[PDB]
């Protein structure tokens, strides 16, 4: 019985591969040779957010592109005012091993989680003005790797137990469960319409899931190692994935295969964070070699290098208006980079 | 300066002084990571160190030795795969790796786990406090003679007791020979790589003695000293 099922699965995989080969008439590089190259991009640091007692593990931008939330593994969650470098909030955490943080689109809630397997959501607009633990979500059997707000009442959270879950804030229960990954899920990226989300795991594959339904739609296996980060394209029809194989890959939700591969001989370290700008032409990826690389999404060349961190880059984010790029690192310093004409 | 901006600056200064106090508290405390297999007596050590004091994901135990606070973190509900979350412990003071010395069949698995921890890219700068737990069980197994280490490790046949060994006065020579063979097996892997940037501290633990935490304290002291010696390039 098992042998027949395995043979049928292999036949289905071969048919999918044949269909992908048939629909791949040409590559992105072949038709992107006629576009003007971006050139050597140069960026400079504008702000240096310091004050964290330990390594910064994740950060997230607000919808106003002014307040940013960062999590440190010393047990602190700091909300900074980017423009004036002031610390708006400093929430102590019960668990000091936070690995991710999320800022609500309305800004009234901030979520965090980590090795404690608990998703802690805190208010920012309390009657007394003091922040406190609004809610705690439990049910994951693995470390909480990423979390993202959809609204003020529902949150999508990915855990190290190869499972994602859509939770309801009011009831504190898993409204929806997404399973199918064999490796630990490391990151998730919400689509602009929030109806679908892509999740990457350590099994060198990424999966697309429907928020409202709860089943996997598309699976991608271009990478050869664990996928550490994933970010949706601004149009919502594609995404980029970074892995430990020192190679970024661009996947399209319609072509159902890798379109562009970004790699270099001089780059051999893993990739930790990936993010697109507003236009999607530039892909910023953080690496373990203490610097970040900005690649051209169409030309697949090292458009720019940002070397201003003492330790490995752990997180990267781009504002909604795309005015500046925030990069965290294990050296407890959050660097804000911007371009100049 | 605007009134709203002035209020923001004042609250930022208040948060800064709160963070300064938090940093003063944080520097005094030392964080340790507890690792070991299921057969290892991690739970007994945690219970002893909690009672004596001198879904869940992770467990934290706070104990004070000589007015120094240590927070030991033990892995709770997590999957078998550990290559990812272990990177969170790249800046801990020490890693207490507890090994069941009486488990011959799974001893190779413990050796492989220790080798992986020692050779991890992000754990290269973290020392390991090795505890060879369950010494009484190992002594009883050696005295029984039903199971021989030579079958699992042929090189134990030609192994000899080190001249620097300091066994207990009323200890059987075979027991101390086997325990030092296990210690040397761990130390060969430890010295195989590292280049002196981190060190291993093997200890023999009975899972019930109160001195273990004290031992950890001593080890921590040494690490701190060596850390300073690494700052002045004296080692």
């Amino acid at each position, epitope marked *: 019985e098992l042998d027949q099922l395995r043979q049928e699965a292999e036949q289905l995989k071969n048919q999918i591969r044949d269909a992908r080969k048939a629909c791949a008439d040409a590559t992105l590089s072949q038709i992107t040779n006629n576009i003007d190259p971006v050139g050597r991009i140069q960026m400079r640091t504008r702000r240096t957010l310091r004050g964290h007692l330990a390594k910064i593990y994740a950060m997230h931008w607000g919808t106003d592109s002014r307040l940013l939330v960062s999590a440190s593994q010393d047990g602190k969650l700091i909300i900074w005012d980017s423009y004036t470098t002031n610390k708006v909030h400093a929430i102590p955490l019960r668990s000091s091993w936070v690995m991710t943080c999320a800022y609500a689109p309305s800004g009234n809630y901030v979520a965090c989680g980590g090795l404690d397997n608990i998703c802690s959501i805190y208010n920012l607009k309390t009657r007394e003005g003091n922040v406190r633990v609004s809610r705690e979500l439990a049910g994951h059997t693995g470390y909480l790797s990423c979390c993202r707000f959809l609204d003020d009442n529902q949150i999508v959270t990915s855990s190290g137990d190869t499972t994602c879950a859509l939770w309801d804030i009011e009831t504190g229960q898993q409204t929806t469960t997404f399973t199918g990954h064999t490796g630990d899920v490391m990151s998730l990226s919400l689509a602009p319409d929030t109806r679908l989300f892509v999740s990457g795991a350590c099994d060198a*594959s990424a999966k697309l899931w429907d928020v409202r339904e709860g089943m996997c739609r598309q699976t991608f296996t271009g990478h050869e190692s664990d996928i550490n980060a994933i970010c949706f394209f601004p149009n919502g029809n594609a995404f980029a994935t970074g892995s430990d*194989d020192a190679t970024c890959r661009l996947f399209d939700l319609r072509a159902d295969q890798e379109l562009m591969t970004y790699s270099h001989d001089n780059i051999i370290c893993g990739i930790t964070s990936v993010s697109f700008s507003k236009s999607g032409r530039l892909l910023l990826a953080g690496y373990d070699d203490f610097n970040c690389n900005v690649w051209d999404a169409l030309k697949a060349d090292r458009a720019g290098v940002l070397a201003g961190h003492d330790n490995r880059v752990s997180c990267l984010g781009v504002t909604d208006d795309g005015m500046a790029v925030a990069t965290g690192s294990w050296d407890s310093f959050l660097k804000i980079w911007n371009g100049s004409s | 300066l605007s009134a709203e901006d002035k209020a923001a600056v004042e609250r930022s200064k208040m948060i800064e002084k709160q963070l300064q106090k938090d940093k003063q508290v944080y520097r005094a405390t030392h964080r340790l990571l507890l690792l070991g297999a299921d057969n290892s007596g991690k739970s007994t050590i945690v219970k002893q160190m909690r009672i004596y004091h001198v879904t869940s994901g992770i467990f934290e135990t706070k104990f004070q030795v000589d007015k120094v606070n240590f927070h030991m973190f033990d892995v709770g509900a997590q999957r078998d795969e550990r*290559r990812k979350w272990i990177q969170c412990f790249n800046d801990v003071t020490a890693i207490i790796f507890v090994v069941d010395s009486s488990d011959y069949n799974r001893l190779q698995e413990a050796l492989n786990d220790f080798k992986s921890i020692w*050779n991890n890219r992000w754990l290269r700068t973290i020392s390991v406090i090795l505890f060879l737990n369950k010494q009484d069980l190992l002594a009883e197994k050696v005295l029984a003679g039903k199971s021989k280490i030579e079958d699992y490790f042929p090189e134990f046949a030609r192994y000899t007791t080190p001249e620097d060994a300091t066994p207990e006065p009323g200890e059987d020579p075979r027991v101390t020979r086997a325990k030092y063979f296990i210690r040397d097996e761990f130390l060969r892997i430890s010295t195989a790589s590292g280049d002196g940037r981190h060190y291993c501290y093997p200890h023999f633990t009975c899972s019930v003695d109160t001195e273990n935490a004290r031992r950890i304290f001593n080890d921590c002291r040494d690490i701190i000293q060596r850390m300073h010696l690494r700052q002045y390039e004296l080692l």
Partner: nanobody
Amino acid sequence: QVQLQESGGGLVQPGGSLRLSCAASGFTFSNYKMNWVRQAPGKGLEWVSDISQSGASISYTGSVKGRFTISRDNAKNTLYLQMNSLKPEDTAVYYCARCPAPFTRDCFDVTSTTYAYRGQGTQVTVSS
């Protein structure tokens, strides 16, 4: 997609010789360390032997040291495990495991129960 295909196994008389072959595809064979992991009936996964990218460092476990030979062919991307003087206790399902990250020496969790980067394995039964 990363996949490993194993061949070689079946009933073998005690004291004989056997060869296990592993074919690798979907990744650069030369940039990853290779390991062999066996699962005996009624027991869990255990590490057997490993060989690095260039083959300079080759290690075996205590139970198979001096008995098994592990080699790799980067041109053919083929992993060979020659076993001689087999024992009845050596019957198990054998799988090939790949290092999770390139240019990495420590195989952190190649022996996990649900490790993705491993093949289906082959049964090797030593019976008389």
